[PDB]
Amino acid sequence: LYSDNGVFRVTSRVMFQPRLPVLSDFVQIYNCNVTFVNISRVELHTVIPDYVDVNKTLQEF
Amino acid sequence: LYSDNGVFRVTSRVMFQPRLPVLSDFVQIYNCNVTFVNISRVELHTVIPDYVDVNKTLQEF
Ligand SMILES: *[C@@H]1O[C@H](CO)[C@@H](O[C@@H]2O[C@H](CO)[C@@H](O[C@@H]3O[C@H](CO)[C@@H](O)[C@H](O)[C@@H]3O)[C@H](O)[C@H]2NC(C)=O)[C@H](O)[C@H]1NC(C)=O
Ligand SMILES: *[C@@H]1O[C@H](CO)[C@@H](O[C@@H]2O[C@H](CO)[C@@H](O[C@@H]3O[C@H](CO)[C@@H](O)[C@H](O)[C@@H]3O)[C@H](O)[C@H]2NC(C)=O)[C@H](O)[C@H]1NC(C)=O
Ligand SMILES: *[C@@H]1O[C@H](CO)[C@@H](O)[C@H](O)[C@H]1NC(C)=O
Numbered sequence A, B: 001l002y003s004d005n006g007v008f009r010v011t012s013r014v015m016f017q018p019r020l021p022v023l024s025d026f027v028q029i030y031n032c033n034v035t036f037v038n039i040s041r042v043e044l045h046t047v048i049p050d051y052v053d054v055n056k057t058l059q060e061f
């Protein structure tokens, strides 16, 4: 996972083939080592396209 | 997939590294051999966190 100046993309480690990140690539490993990317839940969709928080949207809608 | 007395977790088979189950680990293989876990669709979220049934929630909301 890397950063092309405000745009996050995912590529391999052997060849350079960029694409966009999707939800099926992430797991959940509780408690957050320090050297991660600080981001709140509201702006998470700017990292992962095609991720809609059902909870907060049904709070709104 | 195992059970720590009402809490379901997923670990490897070589080392013991527990975490929570997510949606990207399951496939759909129709007709249900006998020795599974009997559970209805309403309480499925107690097995899989971050699984919202869109259909029944839009029936409600
Ligand atoms: C994401 O945000 C968190 C919190 O806003 C950052 O965690 C904290 O970061 C500081 C420095 O990056 C860690 O060092 C501390 O610095 C102070 C001096 O201001 C010093 O007095 C402390 O003894 C300590 O050395 C701090 O430990 C850390 N907080 C915790 C609870 O570990 C985090 O660094 C941010 N992410 C990135 C990539 O910067
Ligand atoms: C999940 O629930 C289903 C249905 O509620 C269970 O399926 C049925 O389980 C019984 C015993 O576990 C199976 O054996 C049957 O027992 C009766 C005696 O009560 C006997 O007369 C029958 O000939 C048969 O041996 C039954 O076959 C099975 N139903 C079907 C359609 O196969 C299931 O066992 C439950 N899951 C677990 C893990 O227990
Ligand atoms: C999920 O969403 C519903 C309604 O949007 C809300 O009542 C519930 O508290 C939310 N749960 C979490 C863990 O965000």
Ligand SMILES: *[C@@H]1O[C@H](CO)[C@@H](O)[C@H](O)[C@H]1NC(C)=O
Binding pocket: B054, B055, B056, B057, B058, B059
């Ligand atoms: C999916 O949800 C919609 C509205 O919530 C409903 O009309 C439809 O029957 C549902 N389909 C299934 C297969 O549950």
